């Protein structure tokens, strides 16, 4: 509901599914999510995930599409993991955590 509040709980759930439940990992790394940006009513979630892949869009691109290609499947995963009627639309963003 209150987006800025639910964001903390969702980030923990997103990390658990991301690390132990992968069989097409172009990242092949511990990719860590810096932050999420859920819309009002949680209709759209913006997942900003940094890539342990040498921080180069070459390796990063492999995973971000891989992040996007398996979304419906992972949707189910997070969708059946917090009893949410809103299954958040999934978006993925390499973060310039390092500047």
């Amino acid at each position: 509901g209150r987006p800025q509040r639910v964001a903390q709980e969702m980030q923990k759930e997103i990390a658990l599914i991301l690390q132990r439940e992968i069989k097409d990992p172009r990242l092949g790394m511990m990719t860590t999510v810096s932050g999420v940006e859920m819309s009002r009513d949680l209709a759209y979630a913006k997942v900003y995930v940094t890539f342990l892949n040498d921080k180069d869009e070459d390796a990063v691109k492999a995973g971000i599409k891989a992040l996007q290609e398996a979304s419906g499947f992972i949707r189910s995963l997070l969708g059946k993991a917090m009893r949410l009627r809103i299954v958040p639309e999934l978006t993925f963003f390499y973060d310039n955590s390092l500047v």
């Binding site: 709980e9 923990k12 790394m29 511990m30 860590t32 810096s34 940094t50």
Partner: protein, 117 residues
């Protein structure tokens, strides 16, 4: 006093908290770094930037025994954990390996109920 030269540290890459410790080669952990202990609190203790800066607190204990190598462990998938590893590489201490050792059980422990909106 006594040189070790083969660095081995323990971190606790929890979400809401971020804490590294210095360890002797044969267990016997000696000294530690708490990012929450720096006075960072709430979101500030959890910030990936706080974890990256906590390097100096870990480094001073390492400097006292003058340890060089890096055999450190990560337990817990903290946000921006890779950036903290980048900060340890930015420090320039010789790196031998990092261990992604988030403990996985067999479901033996009963989990507590998740919080709700």
């Amino acid at each position: 006093r006594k040189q070790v030269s083969d660095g081995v540290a323990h971190i606790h890459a929890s979400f809401n908290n971020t804490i590294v410790t210095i360890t002797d080669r044969q267990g016997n952990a000696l000294g530690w770094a708490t990012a929450g202990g720096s006075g960072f609190r709430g979101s500030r203790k959890s910030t990936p930037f706080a974890a990256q800066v906590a390097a100096e607190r870990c480094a001073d204990a390492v400097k006292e025994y003058g340890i060089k190598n890096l055999e450190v462990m990560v337990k817990g998938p903290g946000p921006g954990r890779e950036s903290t590893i980048r900060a340890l590489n930015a420090a320039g201490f010789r790196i031998t390996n990092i261990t992604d050792v988030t403990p996985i059980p067999h479901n033996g422990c009963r989990p507590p109920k998740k919080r709700r909106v």
